[PDB]
Design goal:
By secondary structure, this protein is mainly alpha-helical. It has one domain: 5' to 3' exonuclease, C-terminal subdomain (DNA polymerase, domain 1, Orthogonal Bundle). It has 4 helices and no strands. Helix 2 packs across helix 4. The N and C termini lie far apart (21 Å).
Length: 70
Amino acid sequence: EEESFGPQPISRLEQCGINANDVKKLEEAGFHTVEAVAYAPKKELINIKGISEAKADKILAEAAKLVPMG
C-alpha cells in the first residue's frame, strides 16, 4: 500500500509517542493529527528534518490499520 485516501487521525498514533514521528513529525510543526493528508503531503512535512515515508509512512500505515474511521 502507498499513502492513504481515508482518515488520518494520526494524532493518538504519533502524538501518543509512535516511532520517530512523534519526535519530528509533530515537533517541527505539529502534524500529530489528520494534518498528514490535509494541506501538505506527508512528504512535505518530513522534508523538515529531511525524512519522508520514514516516519510519515510508518504512521498512515499503522493508523489506517488501527484507527479506521471509528
